[PDB]
């Protein structure tokens, strides 16, 4: 028996390449046309069944709190002008079947500390990650799609899709062999390859449901997740899956940009002149 | 004349940009990589104000955080070499500027924000500018108003031509010309029916004021800038500069898109696919 609850937002992204605007908000408070990416990964993880969220933070910790609470004056306020649309858009920020709480990363360490960081809110619990910087734009959540894996074949799973062999050396790529037609079974894992010496061009984007033994292999182990996923590799079932799904990368200003366009086209009807 | 203080209403409800600004007011959504209220902040500093007024509302934890120092940011910067990052932090607020908070008491238009800021004033002109009237000029726009002021001792409004069919957008001068670019304001008309409006002269979010002002929006009763600027005509002389420059109303969403994309192409060769 699986079931995947909780999930885990790295919410502390310097975004230096995004200064001066990240120097009073995390990276994943920018918004794309009028959504905080934090917020996409959180709807996202809402959609596919999670209850629990689990923000890890940094600095400027009380732009994603301030976000994510309760705001009565905020509230009361639109009540009262009668803005009922409005009203119910922030009350669904953090909607009433879904909770949330809030750990400090001790230093910016990486994504592998910051996962670790977790460990006291998830127990021996599988969990999910979503790194807000990827956004994803699915028909079908993709973190569901990755959950639904983890379930039926009883190990974690990365969300991968297929890059230019050229881009990478901007990933974590897997050896994997495959299982069905989007699934795979990972057995190894390589951060960054050269292009001409990269195993495969199946990159790890900023999905994952991970079982609670990883947990032990951050222990061990900036300290990467990748080192920990390459570990647990040797204990337990790791699975790649091709989601369905459309992703930008906002790590980047042009990648940000080409969200903005395509999300405003899509869903605010924006047109560049 | 001398105009050294500038005044910044950033308690911008922005509830055409609710949910990303839930937590931070409006003037804090970054165009690319900065926040709408540095643009104008930088456009007043280039001007010669020195002394800077926020007028906060609620989330007024974003406006401070990203103006006051961040120690913690600059030593982390440093250690990191990342030099010409930390300049760019350290120029958020330049050496020789100062600034100052004060919270609006409720949220009652434009003329009560600059009416707050009034004990920080005393009785000398001062600037006013709305960050949302985002403007990119080759000379600073409040510069250029600030000239006028001095040359001719007299309030001034920056004032731009807009279609006739969206007059009711905005604030609209009636006046005659001094010069080419200058008026004298004889009146001023709140959003009129285009078919009734006097003119297509509309006043943007640039102002040099005297103080005569705050005793005339003593007596309004929202009170509307607008009004503390028509009773300010009978007592006193006020013009209207069309200043070089291009304006970006990012008041709306289309109009916040269009000056991600024609500032994104300009100064970061960012362009739609």
Same mark, same amino acid.
């Given at each position: 028996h699986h079931v995947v609850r909780k999930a885990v937002f790295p919410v502390a !992204?310097? $975004?230096?390449?995004? +200064?001066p605007a990240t120097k009073a908000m995390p990276k994943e408070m920018l918004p794309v046309v009028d959504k905080p990416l934090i917020q996409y990964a959180v709807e996202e993880a809402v959609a596919a069944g999670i209850t629990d969220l689990i923000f890890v933070t940094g600095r400027n910790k009380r732009a994603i709190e301030d976000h994510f609470d309760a705001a009565p004056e905020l509230e009361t306020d639109l009540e009262?002008?009668?803005?009922?649309?409005?009203?119910?858009?922030?009350?669904?920020?953090?909607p009433a079947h879904?909770?949330?709480?809030?750990?400090?990363?001790?230093?910016?360490? !990486?994504? $592998?500390?910051?996962? +670790?960081?977790?460990?006291?809110?998830?127990?021996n619990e599988p969990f999910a990650v979503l790194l807000a910087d990827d956004l994803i734009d699915a028909?079908?959540?993709?973190?569901?799609?990755?959950?639904?894996?983890?379930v039926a074949r009883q190990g974690s799973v990365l969300g991968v899709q297929e890059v230019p062999r050229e881009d990478t050396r901007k990933y974590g790529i897997v050896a994997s062999q495959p299982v069905d037609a989007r699934t795979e079974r990972v057995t190894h894992i390589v951060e960054k390859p050269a292009p001409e010496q990269a195993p495969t061009t199946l990159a790890v984007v900023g999905r994952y449901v991970l079982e609670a033994a990883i947990?032990?292999?951050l222990r061990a182990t900036e300290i990467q997740l990748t080192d920990g996923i390459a570990a647990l590799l040797r204990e337990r079932d790791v699975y790649a899956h091709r989601y369905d799904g459309k992703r930008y990368d906002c790590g980047s200003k042009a990648g940000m940009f080409q969200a903005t366009v395509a999300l405003g086209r899509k869903y605010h009807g924006l047109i560049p002149e």
């Open positions: !992204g310097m $975004g230096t390449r995004f +200064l009262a002008k009668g803005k009922h649309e409005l009203l119910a858009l922030v009350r669904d920020i953090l879904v909770n949330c709480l809030y750990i400090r990363q001790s230093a910016p360490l !990486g994504l $592998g500390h910051a996962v +670790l960081t977790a460990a006291p809110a998830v127990g028909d079908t959540p993709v973190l569901k799609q990755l959950i639904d894996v983890a947990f032990d292999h």
